[PDB]
Design a protein around this nucleic acid. Structure first.
Ligand SMILES: [Cl-]
Ligand SMILES: [Mg+2]
Length: 276
DNA sequence: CGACGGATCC
DNA sequence: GCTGATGCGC
DNA sequence: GGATCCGTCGGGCGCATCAGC
């Protein structure tokens, strides 16, 4: 079935107005995404913070349109050192963060360009591009080891502020998070190992899945569709992109959106509204 | 990774 | 410099 | 014998490199 995201709820359950709009987007190649008008969509969305994954672009190759964003003037970029053209993440913010860091512990030695941490006044924001288990699951054990190091890194963040984790976490948590659960149990993104790793992530940190907290029984809500076989037009897709929140942030949660109609990548954007 | 062919379930 | 092939990963 | 399960196959994207010119 096709899916239509509900209207934006800009008020918390208690009546407080949203003050913070965060958008996250795996752009599947930042330079291509810009040529497909992705930045025109960002401007219409007008988020306070923009997190991008799979930029596939080192900072010297960023198109100049990116410096024509006065409302997102504080920009932080990461690309892997060994393999440019893969991975790459970015974080763009209206206000300047108190602190920015990269990686999950040893990035100065294994520059992977998958994780940016930004500390703001009231919360810590992490955006992540989680490593893929690969065709035939050839890199599944690496992803399991990565999941474990990531969980431990997130638990061990020094600050006492609540945590917002967003981005492409590269797993459909439950059966409701993808169109063909049974046929994909041996495919990257839906193995029992990655699914359990996600569950452990929510328990260990601990974190809540903002969209599923608000919409616990809503099916066919996806953020990724393979370019192949016209999957997106048939809404055969997967929910791979999340906003995960500290429990203390749930009373501030107004809405968590899936921007199904925004084109330019094989993922669509997701948007978070918080009343901070 | 979904479409597809083929086997299995009652 | 530019195109289109191939290779790689998603 | 319709629905479901299960394994195999062909391949849309973006970007780096390479060959040719
Ligand atoms: Cl930077
Ligand atoms: Mg991808």
């Amino acid at each position: 079935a096709l899916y239509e995201d509900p209207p934006d709820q800009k008020t918390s359950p208690s009546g407080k107005p949203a003050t913070l709009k965060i958008c996250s987007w795996n752009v599947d190649g930042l330079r291509a995404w810009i040529k497909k008008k992705g930045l025109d969509w960002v401007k219409e969305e007008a988020p306070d913070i923009l997190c991008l994954q799979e930029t596939k672009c080192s900072e010297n190759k960023l198109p100049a349109e990116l410096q024509e964003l006065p409302g997102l003037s504080h920009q932080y970029w990461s690309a892997p050192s060994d393999k440019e053209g893969y991975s790459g993440v970015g974080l763009l913010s209206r206000q300047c963060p108190l602190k920015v860091s990269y990686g999950i512990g040893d990035e100065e030695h294994d520059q992977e360009g998958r994780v940016i941490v930004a500390e703001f006044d009231s919360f810590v924001l992490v955006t992540a591009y989680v490593p893929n288990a690969g065709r035939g699951l050839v890199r599944l054990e690496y992803r399991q080891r990565w999941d474990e190091a990531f969980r431990k890194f997130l638990k061990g963040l020094a600050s006492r502020k609540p945590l917002v984790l967003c981005g492409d976490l590269n797993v459909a948590h439950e059966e409701i998070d993808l169109r063909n659960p049974k046929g994909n149990k041996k495919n990257a993104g839906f193995t029992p190992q990655e699914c359990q790793g996600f569950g452990e992530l929510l328990q260990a940190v601990p974190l809540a899945d903002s969209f599923r907290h608000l919409y616990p029984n809503t099916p066919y809500a996806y953020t990724f569709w393979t370019y192949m076989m016209n999957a997106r037009s048939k809404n055969v897709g997967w929910r791979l992109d999340y906003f995960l929140l500290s429990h203390s942030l749930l009373p501030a949660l107004c809405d968590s959106k899936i921007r199904s109609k925004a084109l330019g990548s094989d993922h669509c954007p997701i948007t978070l509204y918080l009343a901070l």
